Amino acid sequence: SMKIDVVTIFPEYLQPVRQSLPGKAIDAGLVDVAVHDLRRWTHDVHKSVDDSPYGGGPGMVMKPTVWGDALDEICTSETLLVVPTPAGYPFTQETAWQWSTEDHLVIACGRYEGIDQRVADDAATRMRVREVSIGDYVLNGGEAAALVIIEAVLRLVPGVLGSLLEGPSYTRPPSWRGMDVPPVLLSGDHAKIAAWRAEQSRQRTIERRPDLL
Amino acid sequence: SMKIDVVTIFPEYLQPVGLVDVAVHDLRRWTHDVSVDDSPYGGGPGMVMKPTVWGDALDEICTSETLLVVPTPAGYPFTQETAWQWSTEDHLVIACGRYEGIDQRVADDAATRMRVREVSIGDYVLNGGEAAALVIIEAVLRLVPGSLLEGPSYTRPPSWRGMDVPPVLLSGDHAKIAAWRAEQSRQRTIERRPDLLGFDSP
Ligand SMILES: N#Cc1c(-c2ccc3ccn(Cc4ccc(CN5CCCC5)cc4)c3c2)n[nH]c1N
Ligand SMILES: N#Cc1c(-c2ccc3ccn(Cc4ccc(CN5CCCC5)cc4)c3c2)n[nH]c1N
């Protein structure tokens, strides 16, 4: 039973998550995902969420007063606050496993150059906070990272969404555009098949991810 | 100028996506059955997407100039270097798998005609290629013409809940500010991503 709250200035971006949630899991109270527009917590008629960086430099920084109010309303002491950032600890499958047993995740999606650091620092004095990155590339903001995190975590929660590299997979037809499925797979020698797959995995890992070796 | 075509059995998922155009195609539009997947040869759990439907879709969508991108957990890593490389391409086609993935012959056949890249966006498991497509598109499109971890950023007010913006950032001394920011970045990189500086991962 997990609740996920996402806070963002682009709530429409989180539409796919709601699209991918089976009715059965929601009706069984296994999961609830809520998306909140950050501008609900702005102070001014112009609904301002950003401001110039101290110390100068390019871009803008999201305002701590707006984020502080939003998180004050949404979080509790039991919340795991997740903050996507290109400067974060790596989000991995181990992370996803750990978070799949949480009661309450709140994902704070930044834009511009990110969120004033005092927001996370203040939150960390009364709840668990995790600054994480989903990969070594640069995005426009936290929303795409939130989609990835939500999917990776929820697929590990029983009945919610419906090392070496894996080798190639094949299905019907047995021959297609001049390429035959590897005969060993049709041999009925299941120890040999397992050994073939293991060697394929080993070779692919060497070629594509030698860092794992 | 870049064109991006995404092929998926879940077009609705791609909704978050004139120098660039993005088009989303339902893979089932290329079926003749009143089924896109079947059980794996050699056995194993789950289902595999059949090559037949993919071949027909890609025949119609791709040319020999196309870069065919195939998200897969067993892919080469997609990094910022990859994003720079792809940013000057004329035509990206992203083939999004579901179930246990796509029959390997799809990528193998395509590679006789065009350039093919099997890539992974990170070391975690998704339910299919769509979320990876969204990440790849976002990372690439922000680089289309027309190291160290970043340190912390701050903005107004200079004191908030009794927490002060680091005084150096208020000082106006460009040299001391640059130095402090370099130190913060160093500290953050050592703590969070020591591999980037050639140290062992924790
Ligand atoms: N997870 C995750 C992420 C994100 C991510 C997550 C959250 C936000 C909020 C805003 N942005 C955009 C941005 C863009 C450029 C810079 C400048 N830096 C200078 C050197 C590098 C970046 C800073 C922020 C975000 C990006 N990007 N990549 C990931 N794996
Ligand atoms: N990029 C990227 C990706 C993906 C991704 C990309 C494309 C597809 C198409 C289908 N799936 C789902 C899937 C899930 C698990 C397995 C492994 N098997 C499970 C049981 C035994 C092995 C195979 C496929 C995909 C996942 N995941 N993580 C990334 N960084």
Length of chain B, please?
A: 202
Domain ranges for chain A, please list them.
2-155
Residue B25, CA distances (Å) to A1, A2, A10, B22, B62 in order: 35, 33, 24, 10, 13
Contacts with B48 (C-beta within 8 Å, 6 or more apart), sequence order: A169, A170, A171, B37, B38, B39, B40, B99, B100, B101, B102, B103
Whether residue A149 contacts residue A97, with contact meaning beta carbons closer than 8 Å, is answered with no
Nearest C-alpha in B relative to A210 = B76
CATH topology for A2-155 is Alpha/beta knot (3.40.1280)
Type and span of the H or E element at A147: helix A143-154
Continuous segment of H or E residues that includes residue A199: helix A190-208
Looking at residue A183, the DSSP 8-state letter turns out to be G
Q: Where are the alpha helices (DSSP H) in chain B?
A: 51-61, 80-86, 104-110, 130-141, 168-171, 174-192
Nearest C-alpha neighbor of A115 from the set A77, A71, A74:
A71
Is the peptide bond prior to A173 cis by the omega test (within 30 degrees of 0)? yes
Mutate one of B38, B59, B124, B188 to test the A interface: name it (highest A CB count within 10 A). Answer: B124
Among the listed residues B94, B86, B106, the one whose alpha carbon sits nearest the alpha carbon of residue B132: B94
Method: X-ray
Ligand 2 atom closest to Cα of residue B129: 7
Which amino acid is it at B166?
P
Alpha-carbon distance of A32 to A154, in angstroms, equals 11
| Cβ–Cβ below 8 Å for A170 and B74 | no
Deposited resolution, Å? 1.7
For residue A130, the cross-strand partners are A82
> Order of strands, edge to edge, in the sheet holding B115-120?
B20-26, B2-8, B91-95, B67-77, B115-120
Residue B16 CB burial class (10 angstroms; 0-12, 13-18, ≥19): middle
Nearest ligand (C-alpha, residue A120): 1
What is the spatial distance between Cα B24 and Cα B8, in angstroms, rounded to a whole number? 8
3-state secondary structure of A6: strand
Smallest CA-to-CA distance from B105 within A186, A103, A195, A176 is with: A176
Distance CA A90, CA A124 (A): 19
For B166, the 3-state DSSP assignment is coil
3-state secondary structure of A188: coil
Flag if B42 and A117 touch (Cβ within 8 Å).
no
* C-alpha span between B58 and B14 (Å, rounded): 18
Q: Which structure tokens are listed for B59?
A: 């025949």
Q: Domain B2-142: which CATH class?
A: alpha beta
The CA distance from B96 to B71, in Å, is 6
Give SS3 for A190. helix
Helix (H) or strand (E) holding B68: strand B67-77
A139 lines ligand 1 (CB under 6 A): yes
Q: How far is the C-alpha of A46 from the C-alpha of A195, rounded, in Å?
A: 64
Burial of B44 per CB tally in 10 Å (0-12, 13-18, 19+):
middle
CA of A81 to the centre of ligand 1 (A): 18
Q: Could you list the beta-strand ranges (E) of A75-201.
A: 80-90, 104-108, 128-133, 175-176, 179-180
CB A128 within 8 A of CB A102: no
What count of other Cβ atoms lies within 10 Å of the Cβ of residue B118?
Answer: 19
From first CA to last CA, the distance across chain B in angstroms is 42
**DSSP assignment string, B3-56:** EEEEEES-GGGGTT---EEEEEEEGGGG------EEPPTT--SS-EE-HHHHHH
Which structure tokens are listed for B114?
């065009």
Mutational test site, ligand 1, from A6, A85, A149, max ligand atoms within 8 Å of CB: A85
Which residues in chain B have Cβ-Cβ distances shorter than 8 Å to A60? 155
Ligand 1 center to A62 CA (angstroms):
13
